């Protein structure tokens, strides 16, 4: 096991500089503080010589604020000088109450440190492919080359020849400043259509269904999970993936700790400890933790067949509607009462690819969705009794006839699952029918991925459905590719084919560049353009590390991330905070928003030089010198309530921030919105929510049924608690890589025996889409025939075996993957030190 | 003046006091730092004795300091607060959990009379900023 052998840490002194920090990583947005102080100073164990005012010569008790782990300590540059830093969770932040996950608590150790040699992979300089390899250069050189090639291609072939891949999320590698700067470049200065997002291959929403129904997907507050009678958790592994939301809000409900608060806020009805329905084909550590906390009688794990959620939800809706377990006043007052006609190709197909489902009234949706318990039991594999029990735990009135309060939360098991549009709508139907939106203890919400921090100019020009960018690239289209803060080589669908073509097309441009003279810039640009014209691709990567897709790129531009810059984002209850800069970007790295501005300035210069002064003028409005300037041009001027928010005001609110949208500012406090839709007015033109007539139609995405029928195992996929995303930081973190040097594939031990596999064996997963590798991890809780492989991982990429299949709106159906498995190697020596024990607490 | 922590060499028990797969409560490097000695019946990392199977660990969870329980059936330490699991057969490796550290393990030595001494720890013990206060 990896051990740091750090026996003692510098003590934060009483005069350390304090900075508010939101976690860099997941949606929950736990509050931290970064304390910095000079390298040649330190605190002492006496109360007056440390920030805590306690005597650190004594052992602290459980849950003490006056401790931090080595992963929370580093030395970093701040205003040109080395400083000690501690980045530790905020006991007073209501999101996390002092909890730090295994990810957030390593922010300091995953920071760049020349003194302590952490994250020495971090990019420091612009790099260009020249003289046979990547070479470091100046910004002025690199930007000039990018702009000259980009400008020439767009002038000769149109803006459609520019392909963009970019983050749209919050937190590190996103946020309001950074989404605004990239958005303004591609959607205000330009009208780029061939743009995709970090996690999906088109410029779409993950949740068009709920949005088209008038229900924005982040409509509740975290307190709601404490107040619900029932939590319904669909396609979420929240202990591992929304950790401190689960631990600090869900767990108190299930344990009965929130009962006092429930009785106080809602005195006119009965309350018991929370029950939870978990809809997930896999038994996860989340299921286990719920059983251990609430008791097994208060947990209903519906271990559905992969991709069958829609059949479940429609049977639930049917049953609940037929019993009259619905909020009739809510339906009558706040939902669409209009009769509507089903489209001509219904039920198999919507009115067009833009509209996969049919929006209607309650009554019409019930009739359209209608599914018997027995039919849903057949499809889902559940027992009739389980489905009936779930209907009762959602819909059945409590003693005295009082409406049961249910928080419906969903994440990527639904969103990257079968028939995204219909499945999403079918779940929202339950929340709408039961009046569980806009009230305490309710909500139908994404549980979320990254934080959120989107503000951009209009995307109306992208269309709906938008372009399937990966398919354009694979099919030889597009000339120039700008990649911002994402790595398709590890995380796209159909990744094996993607990599094969991407390499060949970028190699064409590499080979041209190597053979042309760089010091004659015009000749270099012409050689690049000639290779593009022959079917090549010139690629530019903006990132913080050497990425996998970056190995194919021609120019790399170094970004600075959260903490090396000021950054604003909100969490899964819309809680907006400012992360205050506590350290310097590595080397010559620059915030994304300022890279976008410098690139816009370069484009204006280059296009003016080429004689296209009218196009050049579209790249004005990027005079930013600091990220706050992007905040002020974007969020402050464009967001709802934006005029109330400034860095200074956010800073004064601390890690508690406020909940968006802001409605005013009084007495040094930005005032916010705790819950959406509390007046029953929804986000549609008439203010009414729509239900969705969303019938089951099998596995919707092309080729999925045939993939399932022709391969032996389900290759379910997703996250591990210990790993953050594609392990971009984690790959230089010994704690993480010592645990999983290879991605695990969870396998039933009997399945392993049948396939001749032992723990730690390196296996090949393969199908019609591609092939990859993983390390077999015996998992007694896995169902026979069903495996789960860690996604996104550099030493074996799961996406290689995901097909190109999407829904009509180009949502990637990653979760429905099947393949074969065969051994590549006996367990390598480098996994001999691993534990292969159960991840379930006992 | 010293660059490193000065650990004391403290006697914890005698090998004769240990039963196979039953933790013995100890404290190291002082009485306020709870831990256990455990004889596992198989040679393991950091393990001492004739069989290389005797290990010592801190039993205070490195996440938020809840006391760990031992599961004799799994040979794991288990945290009831946030569901962490540590494997004393593999150097205290966190099988699943919230800590950013594997379980602090004692550097042990067995004297010729069977006395077991602890003379260091390989991670920062929960709740102190110096392992030797
Ligand atoms: N099979 C399968 N595939 C999946 C999924 C799944 O469930 N199954 N999930 C999908 C989802 S939900 C997601 S979010 C995607 C993730 O896919 P990606 O977004 O491709 O993955 P990340 O690892 O989040 O990549 C972040 C990149 O941004 C860089 N970066 C970090 N901070 C900064 C910064 O401040 N600036 C810049 N410029 N770069 C920075 C990192 O170094 C890294 O290269 O994967 C998707 N792919
Ligand atoms: N530890 C950690 N946490 C993270 C992240 C991370 O990288 N590491 N990433 C963040 C991001 S960007 C996101 S998007 C979220 C993802 O959060 P989640 O969506 O909670 O995580 P996943 O592991 O992708 O998938 C959740 C569950 O979906 C289940 N599932 C698979 N197929 C189906 C299906 O057909 N139906 C149903 N109902 N469930 C299905 C899987 O068995 C899995 O347990 O997590 C965020 N939090
Ligand atoms: S510590 Fe960070 S990774 Fe998520 S659970 Fe909290 S925001
Ligand atoms: S205190 Fe042990 S898991 Fe958090
Ligand atoms: Mo995501
Ligand atoms: O996401």
JSON list of C-alpha atoms in Angstrom, two decimals, chain A residues 483-621:
[
{"chain": "A", "resi": 483, "resn": "UNK", "atom": "CA", "xyz": [-10.11, 21.26, -28.12]},
{"chain": "A", "resi": 484, "resn": "UNK", "atom": "CA", "xyz": [-10.73, 22.85, -24.75]},
{"chain": "A", "resi": 485, "resn": "UNK", "atom": "CA", "xyz": [-10.56, 20.92, -21.48]},
{"chain": "A", "resi": 486, "resn": "UNK", "atom": "CA", "xyz": [-11.70, 17.48, -22.64]},
{"chain": "A", "resi": 487, "resn": "UNK", "atom": "CA", "xyz": [-9.97, 14.28, -23.82]},
{"chain": "A", "resi": 488, "resn": "UNK", "atom": "CA", "xyz": [-12.04, 12.26, -26.30]},
{"chain": "A", "resi": 489, "resn": "UNK", "atom": "CA", "xyz": [-9.32, 9.58, -26.50]},
{"chain": "A", "resi": 490, "resn": "UNK", "atom": "CA", "xyz": [-10.32, 8.50, -22.99]},
{"chain": "A", "resi": 491, "resn": "UNK", "atom": "CA", "xyz": [-13.99, 9.59, -22.73]},
{"chain": "A", "resi": 492, "resn": "UNK", "atom": "CA", "xyz": [-15.87, 9.68, -26.09]},
{"chain": "A", "resi": 493, "resn": "UNK", "atom": "CA", "xyz": [-18.16, 6.97, -27.43]},
{"chain": "A", "resi": 494, "resn": "UNK", "atom": "CA", "xyz": [-16.88, 4.68, -30.19]},
{"chain": "A", "resi": 495, "resn": "UNK", "atom": "CA", "xyz": [-13.42, 5.74, -28.99]},
{"chain": "A", "resi": 496, "resn": "UNK", "atom": "CA", "xyz": [-11.38, 3.03, -30.78]},
{"chain": "A", "resi": 497, "resn": "UNK", "atom": "CA", "xyz": [-12.53, 4.06, -34.22]},
{"chain": "A", "resi": 498, "resn": "UNK", "atom": "CA", "xyz": [-12.28, 7.69, -33.20]},
{"chain": "A", "resi": 499, "resn": "UNK", "atom": "CA", "xyz": [-8.60, 7.26, -32.23]},
{"chain": "A", "resi": 500, "resn": "UNK", "atom": "CA", "xyz": [-7.75, 5.33, -35.42]},
{"chain": "A", "resi": 501, "resn": "UNK", "atom": "CA", "xyz": [-9.08, 8.04, -37.72]},
{"chain": "A", "resi": 502, "resn": "UNK", "atom": "CA", "xyz": [-7.98, 10.98, -35.57]},
{"chain": "A", "resi": 503, "resn": "UNK", "atom": "CA", "xyz": [-4.41, 9.72, -35.58]},
{"chain": "A", "resi": 504, "resn": "UNK", "atom": "CA", "xyz": [-4.33, 9.26, -39.37]},
{"chain": "A", "resi": 505, "resn": "UNK", "atom": "CA", "xyz": [-5.78, 12.69, -40.12]},
{"chain": "A", "resi": 506, "resn": "UNK", "atom": "CA", "xyz": [-3.52, 14.54, -37.65]},
{"chain": "A", "resi": 507, "resn": "UNK", "atom": "CA", "xyz": [-0.51, 12.53, -38.88]},
{"chain": "A", "resi": 508, "resn": "UNK", "atom": "CA", "xyz": [-1.09, 13.99, -42.38]},
{"chain": "A", "resi": 509, "resn": "UNK", "atom": "CA", "xyz": [-0.63, 17.46, -40.96]},
{"chain": "A", "resi": 510, "resn": "UNK", "atom": "CA", "xyz": [2.30, 16.34, -38.76]},
{"chain": "A", "resi": 511, "resn": "UNK", "atom": "CA", "xyz": [4.11, 14.94, -41.82]},
{"chain": "A", "resi": 512, "resn": "UNK", "atom": "CA", "xyz": [3.57, 18.20, -43.75]},
{"chain": "A", "resi": 513, "resn": "UNK", "atom": "CA", "xyz": [4.75, 20.36, -40.86]},
{"chain": "A", "resi": 514, "resn": "UNK", "atom": "CA", "xyz": [7.91, 18.27, -40.35]},
{"chain": "A", "resi": 515, "resn": "UNK", "atom": "CA", "xyz": [8.87, 18.76, -44.00]},
{"chain": "A", "resi": 516, "resn": "UNK", "atom": "CA", "xyz": [8.15, 22.48, -44.31]},
{"chain": "A", "resi": 517, "resn": "UNK", "atom": "CA", "xyz": [10.33, 25.36, -43.05]},
{"chain": "A", "resi": 518, "resn": "UNK", "atom": "CA", "xyz": [8.95, 26.88, -39.81]},
{"chain": "A", "resi": 519, "resn": "UNK", "atom": "CA", "xyz": [10.97, 30.11, -39.94]},
{"chain": "A", "resi": 520, "resn": "UNK", "atom": "CA", "xyz": [9.10, 30.88, -43.19]},
{"chain": "A", "resi": 521, "resn": "UNK", "atom": "CA", "xyz": [5.72, 31.07, -41.51]},
{"chain": "A", "resi": 522, "resn": "UNK", "atom": "CA", "xyz": [3.73, 31.54, -44.70]},
{"chain": "A", "resi": 523, "resn": "UNK", "atom": "CA", "xyz": [5.23, 28.36, -46.17]},
{"chain": "A", "resi": 524, "resn": "UNK", "atom": "CA", "xyz": [4.39, 26.43, -42.97]},
{"chain": "A", "resi": 525, "resn": "UNK", "atom": "CA", "xyz": [0.75, 27.67, -43.03]},
{"chain": "A", "resi": 526, "resn": "UNK", "atom": "CA", "xyz": [0.43, 26.75, -46.69]},
{"chain": "A", "resi": 527, "resn": "UNK", "atom": "CA", "xyz": [1.80, 23.28, -46.10]},
{"chain": "A", "resi": 528, "resn": "UNK", "atom": "CA", "xyz": [-0.71, 22.78, -43.27]},
{"chain": "A", "resi": 529, "resn": "UNK", "atom": "CA", "xyz": [-3.61, 24.00, -45.37]},
{"chain": "A", "resi": 530, "resn": "UNK", "atom": "CA", "xyz": [-2.56, 21.75, -48.27]},
{"chain": "A", "resi": 531, "resn": "UNK", "atom": "CA", "xyz": [-2.59, 18.71, -45.92]},
{"chain": "A", "resi": 532, "resn": "UNK", "atom": "CA", "xyz": [-6.01, 19.79, -44.59]},
{"chain": "A", "resi": 533, "resn": "UNK", "atom": "CA", "xyz": [-7.29, 20.04, -48.16]},
{"chain": "A", "resi": 534, "resn": "UNK", "atom": "CA", "xyz": [-6.19, 16.43, -48.75]},
{"chain": "A", "resi": 535, "resn": "UNK", "atom": "CA", "xyz": [-8.24, 15.22, -45.75]},
{"chain": "A", "resi": 536, "resn": "UNK", "atom": "CA", "xyz": [-5.97, 16.06, -42.82]},
{"chain": "A", "resi": 537, "resn": "UNK", "atom": "CA", "xyz": [-6.87, 17.88, -39.62]},
{"chain": "A", "resi": 538, "resn": "UNK", "atom": "CA", "xyz": [-4.96, 20.60, -37.77]},
{"chain": "A", "resi": 539, "resn": "UNK", "atom": "CA", "xyz": [-5.62, 20.28, -34.05]},
{"chain": "A", "resi": 540, "resn": "UNK", "atom": "CA", "xyz": [-5.08, 22.65, -31.14]},
{"chain": "A", "resi": 541, "resn": "UNK", "atom": "CA", "xyz": [-5.35, 21.56, -27.52]},
{"chain": "A", "resi": 542, "resn": "UNK", "atom": "CA", "xyz": [-5.98, 23.88, -24.54]},
{"chain": "A", "resi": 543, "resn": "UNK", "atom": "CA", "xyz": [-5.37, 21.97, -21.34]},
{"chain": "A", "resi": 544, "resn": "UNK", "atom": "CA", "xyz": [-3.39, 21.79, -18.06]},
{"chain": "A", "resi": 545, "resn": "UNK", "atom": "CA", "xyz": [-1.53, 18.50, -18.77]},
{"chain": "A", "resi": 546, "resn": "UNK", "atom": "CA", "xyz": [-0.25, 16.48, -21.76]},
{"chain": "A", "resi": 547, "resn": "UNK", "atom": "CA", "xyz": [-3.49, 14.74, -22.73]},
{"chain": "A", "resi": 548, "resn": "UNK", "atom": "CA", "xyz": [-4.08, 11.59, -24.75]},
{"chain": "A", "resi": 549, "resn": "UNK", "atom": "CA", "xyz": [-5.75, 13.41, -27.65]},
{"chain": "A", "resi": 550, "resn": "UNK", "atom": "CA", "xyz": [-2.98, 15.98, -27.26]},
{"chain": "A", "resi": 551, "resn": "UNK", "atom": "CA", "xyz": [-0.51, 13.34, -28.48]},
{"chain": "A", "resi": 552, "resn": "UNK", "atom": "CA", "xyz": [-2.21, 13.91, -31.88]},
{"chain": "A", "resi": 553, "resn": "UNK", "atom": "CA", "xyz": [-2.31, 17.73, -31.70]},
{"chain": "A", "resi": 554, "resn": "UNK", "atom": "CA", "xyz": [-0.12, 20.29, -33.47]},
{"chain": "A", "resi": 555, "resn": "UNK", "atom": "CA", "xyz": [-0.32, 23.11, -30.93]},
{"chain": "A", "resi": 556, "resn": "UNK", "atom": "CA", "xyz": [-0.80, 22.89, -27.16]},
{"chain": "A", "resi": 557, "resn": "UNK", "atom": "CA", "xyz": [-1.71, 25.97, -25.14]},
{"chain": "A", "resi": 558, "resn": "UNK", "atom": "CA", "xyz": [-1.29, 25.89, -21.34]},
{"chain": "A", "resi": 559, "resn": "UNK", "atom": "CA", "xyz": [-4.24, 26.75, -19.13]},
{"chain": "A", "resi": 560, "resn": "UNK", "atom": "CA", "xyz": [-4.45, 27.78, -15.52]},
{"chain": "A", "resi": 561, "resn": "UNK", "atom": "CA", "xyz": [-7.15, 26.12, -13.42]},
{"chain": "A", "resi": 562, "resn": "UNK", "atom": "CA", "xyz": [-9.29, 26.99, -10.40]},
{"chain": "A", "resi": 563, "resn": "UNK", "atom": "CA", "xyz": [-7.27, 28.37, -7.50]},
{"chain": "A", "resi": 564, "resn": "UNK", "atom": "CA", "xyz": [-4.61, 29.69, -9.88]},
{"chain": "A", "resi": 565, "resn": "UNK", "atom": "CA", "xyz": [-7.40, 32.01, -10.96]},
{"chain": "A", "resi": 566, "resn": "UNK", "atom": "CA", "xyz": [-10.63, 33.37, -9.46]},
{"chain": "A", "resi": 567, "resn": "UNK", "atom": "CA", "xyz": [-13.61, 31.22, -10.57]},
{"chain": "A", "resi": 568, "resn": "UNK", "atom": "CA", "xyz": [-17.37, 31.21, -10.08]},
{"chain": "A", "resi": 569, "resn": "UNK", "atom": "CA", "xyz": [-19.78, 28.25, -10.37]},
{"chain": "A", "resi": 570, "resn": "UNK", "atom": "CA", "xyz": [-22.87, 26.83, -8.68]},
{"chain": "A", "resi": 571, "resn": "UNK", "atom": "CA", "xyz": [-23.61, 23.40, -7.21]},
{"chain": "A", "resi": 572, "resn": "UNK", "atom": "CA", "xyz": [-26.51, 21.04, -7.60]},
{"chain": "A", "resi": 573, "resn": "UNK", "atom": "CA", "xyz": [-28.85, 23.31, -5.56]},
{"chain": "A", "resi": 574, "resn": "UNK", "atom": "CA", "xyz": [-27.73, 26.38, -7.57]},
{"chain": "A", "resi": 575, "resn": "UNK", "atom": "CA", "xyz": [-25.41, 27.60, -4.77]},
{"chain": "A", "resi": 576, "resn": "UNK", "atom": "CA", "xyz": [-23.05, 30.09, -6.44]},
{"chain": "A", "resi": 577, "resn": "UNK", "atom": "CA", "xyz": [-19.64, 30.71, -4.86]},
{"chain": "A", "resi": 578, "resn": "UNK", "atom": "CA", "xyz": [-16.40, 32.50, -5.73]},
{"chain": "A", "resi": 579, "resn": "UNK", "atom": "CA", "xyz": [-13.21, 30.47, -5.45]},
{"chain": "A", "resi": 580, "resn": "UNK", "atom": "CA", "xyz": [-10.59, 33.08, -4.56]},
{"chain": "A", "resi": 581, "resn": "UNK", "atom": "CA", "xyz": [-7.16, 32.76, -6.22]},
{"chain": "A", "resi": 582, "resn": "UNK", "atom": "CA", "xyz": [-4.56, 31.49, -3.72]},
{"chain": "A", "resi": 583, "resn": "UNK", "atom": "CA", "xyz": [-1.65, 30.57, -6.09]},
{"chain": "A", "resi": 584, "resn": "UNK", "atom": "CA", "xyz": [-0.02, 31.37, -9.40]},
{"chain": "A", "resi": 585, "resn": "UNK", "atom": "CA", "xyz": [-0.57, 29.49, -12.70]},
{"chain": "A", "resi": 586, "resn": "UNK", "atom": "CA", "xyz": [2.42, 27.17, -13.50]},
{"chain": "A", "resi": 587, "resn": "UNK", "atom": "CA", "xyz": [4.98, 28.71, -15.88]},
{"chain": "A", "resi": 588, "resn": "UNK", "atom": "CA", "xyz": [3.27, 30.83, -18.55]},
{"chain": "A", "resi": 589, "resn": "UNK", "atom": "CA", "xyz": [-0.13, 29.17, -18.19]},
{"chain": "A", "resi": 590, "resn": "UNK", "atom": "CA", "xyz": [-3.21, 31.39, -18.58]},
{"chain": "A", "resi": 591, "resn": "UNK", "atom": "CA", "xyz": [-6.93, 31.14, -17.61]},
{"chain": "A", "resi": 592, "resn": "UNK", "atom": "CA", "xyz": [-9.09, 29.73, -20.42]},
{"chain": "A", "resi": 593, "resn": "UNK", "atom": "CA", "xyz": [-11.14, 32.91, -20.65]},
{"chain": "A", "resi": 594, "resn": "UNK", "atom": "CA", "xyz": [-7.96, 34.92, -21.30]},
{"chain": "A", "resi": 595, "resn": "UNK", "atom": "CA", "xyz": [-6.63, 32.38, -23.82]},
{"chain": "A", "resi": 596, "resn": "UNK", "atom": "CA", "xyz": [-9.94, 32.82, -25.67]},
{"chain": "A", "resi": 597, "resn": "UNK", "atom": "CA", "xyz": [-9.53, 36.61, -25.50]},
{"chain": "A", "resi": 598, "resn": "UNK", "atom": "CA", "xyz": [-5.90, 36.46, -26.71]},
{"chain": "A", "resi": 599, "resn": "UNK", "atom": "CA", "xyz": [-6.97, 34.13, -29.50]},
{"chain": "A", "resi": 600, "resn": "UNK", "atom": "CA", "xyz": [-9.77, 36.54, -30.45]},
{"chain": "A", "resi": 601, "resn": "UNK", "atom": "CA", "xyz": [-7.26, 39.44, -30.45]},
{"chain": "A", "resi": 602, "resn": "UNK", "atom": "CA", "xyz": [-4.95, 37.36, -32.68]},
{"chain": "A", "resi": 603, "resn": "UNK", "atom": "CA", "xyz": [-7.76, 36.51, -35.06]},
{"chain": "A", "resi": 604, "resn": "UNK", "atom": "CA", "xyz": [-8.66, 40.23, -35.34]},
{"chain": "A", "resi": 605, "resn": "UNK", "atom": "CA", "xyz": [-5.00, 41.02, -36.12]},
{"chain": "A", "resi": 606, "resn": "UNK", "atom": "CA", "xyz": [-4.59, 38.23, -38.64]},
{"chain": "A", "resi": 607, "resn": "UNK", "atom": "CA", "xyz": [-7.84, 38.79, -40.46]},
{"chain": "A", "resi": 608, "resn": "UNK", "atom": "CA", "xyz": [-7.02, 42.54, -40.67]},
{"chain": "A", "resi": 609, "resn": "UNK", "atom": "CA", "xyz": [-3.66, 41.62, -42.21]},
{"chain": "A", "resi": 610, "resn": "UNK", "atom": "CA", "xyz": [-5.39, 39.35, -44.73]},
{"chain": "A", "resi": 611, "resn": "UNK", "atom": "CA", "xyz": [-7.63, 42.27, -45.77]},
{"chain": "A", "resi": 612, "resn": "UNK", "atom": "CA", "xyz": [-10.91, 41.00, -44.24]},
{"chain": "A", "resi": 613, "resn": "UNK", "atom": "CA", "xyz": [-11.51, 43.97, -42.00]},
{"chain": "A", "resi": 614, "resn": "UNK", "atom": "CA", "xyz": [-15.25, 43.40, -41.63]},
{"chain": "A", "resi": 615, "resn": "UNK", "atom": "CA", "xyz": [-14.81, 39.82, -40.36]},
{"chain": "A", "resi": 616, "resn": "UNK", "atom": "CA", "xyz": [-11.91, 40.98, -38.18]},
{"chain": "A", "resi": 617, "resn": "UNK", "atom": "CA", "xyz": [-14.18, 43.48, -36.42]},
{"chain": "A", "resi": 618, "resn": "UNK", "atom": "CA", "xyz": [-16.42, 40.65, -35.19]},
{"chain": "A", "resi": 619, "resn": "UNK", "atom": "CA", "xyz": [-13.54, 39.60, -32.88]},
{"chain": "A", "resi": 620, "resn": "UNK", "atom": "CA", "xyz": [-13.60, 42.83, -30.84]},
{"chain": "A", "resi": 621, "resn": "UNK", "atom": "CA", "xyz": [-14.85, 42.93, -27.23]}
]
